[PDB]
């Protein structure tokens, strides 16, 4: 694989994120606690149950506890550098043992070639997955009641790029057109 050190980051989840795709459809690891692997001191470990969203387009979504493998170049080994994807779940299983799983579903969404948006938020009813007009609509809900604090982009090899933006409790004015889509919006606190 040819990768960047994305696995070393545990980016604050906050309230949620939105992703601009443009096209490898991005793979994410999300959880409540983030730190180092105890053998090699590399950043990138998640503790307890971790949410894995692995596109392969259908989304493979799992909520499992990860137990890193100790073989050569695995997260439990001294010579480890980083895990990567090249089904997405089978590549993860090469680096981690997946145990104590409470959730697993596959979402057939049916995306096109055109630009795509994807989002993740969390509330009392679980983790809400949104997808795209370029408006985000809810397509799935995942029964995770453990607050997500961090997310990680899982490195991939086959170029392509995507952008991740944080969500905030902002007040917006939303302009709906004749087809019922939001075509413009005002971020009220942006400017005068």
């Amino acid at each position: 694989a040819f990768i960047s050190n994305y696995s070393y980051y545990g980016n604050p989840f906050g309230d949620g994120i939105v992703i601009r795709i443009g096209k490898i459809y991005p793979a994410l690891m999300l959880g409540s606690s983030f730190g180092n692997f105890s053998v090699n001191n590399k950043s990138g470990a998640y503790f307890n149950h971790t949410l894995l969203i692995l596109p392969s387009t259908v989304f493979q979504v799992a909520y499992c506890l990860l137990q890193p493998r100790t073989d050569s170049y695995c997260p439990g080994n001294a010579n480890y550098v980083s895990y990567a994807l090249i089904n997405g779940l089978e590549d993860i299983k090469k680096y981690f043992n997946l145990v104590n799983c409470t959730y697993f579903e596959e979402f057939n969404v049916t995306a096109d070639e055109r630009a795509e948006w994807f989002g993740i938020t969390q509330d009392s009813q679980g983790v809400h997955l949104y997808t795209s007009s370029n408006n985000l609509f809810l397509f799935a809900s995942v029964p995770i009641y453990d607050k997500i604090n961090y997310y990680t982009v899982i490195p991939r090899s086959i170029w392509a790029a995507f952008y991740v933006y944080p969500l905030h409790q902002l007040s917006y004015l939303l302009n709906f057109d004749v087809n019922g889509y939001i075509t413009q919006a005002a971020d009220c606190g942006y400017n005068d």
Binding site: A1, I3, S4, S72, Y80, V81, A84, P155
Partner: peptide, 18 residues
């Protein structure tokens, strides 16, 4: 586990603000 070549510098040249 598969071997990875991690070279973060390569992924800077593709930076494009959106």
């Amino acid at each position: 586990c598969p071997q990875v070549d991690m070279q973060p510098s390569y992924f800077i040249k593709h930076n494009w603000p959106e």
